[PDB]
Design a protein around this ligand. Structure first.
Ligand SMILES: [Zn+2]
Length: 231
DNA sequence: GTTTAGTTCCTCGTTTTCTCTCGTTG
DNA sequence: CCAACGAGAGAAAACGAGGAACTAAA
């Protein structure tokens, strides 16, 4: 309206639209202009580094707590890790970007590497949960178009306790929303072993998990056929 | 004996929703 | 001085792959 005139004016001048204390972490504000704060800037470089390693905010919080840092709120770290203010840009409505006059803290190369970690995260729901299967979001139903889901079935039969794992199309799981498509339900241990052998011809657990997401796009299953779509 | 499926009701990192406040320019 | 918008904070709610325990067939 009439007050958008004032906010666009600062962007053309390379100035930030956020100068409030507590909302400009890593920067001191002097006469409405930003200047690095060595105490807080050192944490940001430390935060960006660890997030690349852990590729998770919660894992980032837990490691920072072991370094004496006070753990901020979750959304606090996400905003910090996705705000291009720290590689030297000022933006109106997060879609009109201009290089600011302030000194950046994070390299422009590192910033976008982080952004691809979040991008990959969004395409893989629950990938950072303790229970995420080895192939959490990699298996797709050929006959069905829907994604397979890991399933852990344990039973007590005649006193003895058994434990079994499976990968089944989501149609077998959500019976209130989806009709079964007649696609095979594979033993988890048998399919995982099959994927391993094939990946070999082309580390801890979560190291495996992520290593697969980097060199496989999606895995297709058509009955007994496993066709890996390499990335 | 050993497996393969169903159903109910929880797990929790992540995402999204929705107020509250700050403060610069008009 | 002052109002008003965009933006960061942030508690709550919603997400969704995956679980725990129990059951009956295969
Ligand atoms: Zn299907």
């Amino acid at each position: 309206d009439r007050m958008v005139m004032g906010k666009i004016k600062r962007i053309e001048a390379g100035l930030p639209l956020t100068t409030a204390k507590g909302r400009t972490f890593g920067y001191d504000v002097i006469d409405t202009k930003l200047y690095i704060n060595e105490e807080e800037a050192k944490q940001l470089r430390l935060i960006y580094d660890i997030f690349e390693e852990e590729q998770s905010i919660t894992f980032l919080q837990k490691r920072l707590k072991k370094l004496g840092f006070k753990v901020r709120t979750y959304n606090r770290y996400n905003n910090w890790l996705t705000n291009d203010l720290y590689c030297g840009y000022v933006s109106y409505k997060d879609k009109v970007h201009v290089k600011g006059i302030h000194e950046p803290i994070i390299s422009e190369e590192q910033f976008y590497r982080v952004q691809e970690i979040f991008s990959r995260m969004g395409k893989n729901p629950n990938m950072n949960k303790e229970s995420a299967s080895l192939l959490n979001n990699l298996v797709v139903c050929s006959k069905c178009g829907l994604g397979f889901v890991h399933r852990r079935k344990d039973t007590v039969s005649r006193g003895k306790k058994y434990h079994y794992r499976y990968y089944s199309c989501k149609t077998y799981k959500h019976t209130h929303e989806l009709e079964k498509c007649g696609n095979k339900i594979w033993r988890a241990d048998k399919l995982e072993e099959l994927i391993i052998d094939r990946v070999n011809n082309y580390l801890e657990f979560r190291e495996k998990q992520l290593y697969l997401k980097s060199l496989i796009n999606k895995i297709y299953i058509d009955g007994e056929q496993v066709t890996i779509e390499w990335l």
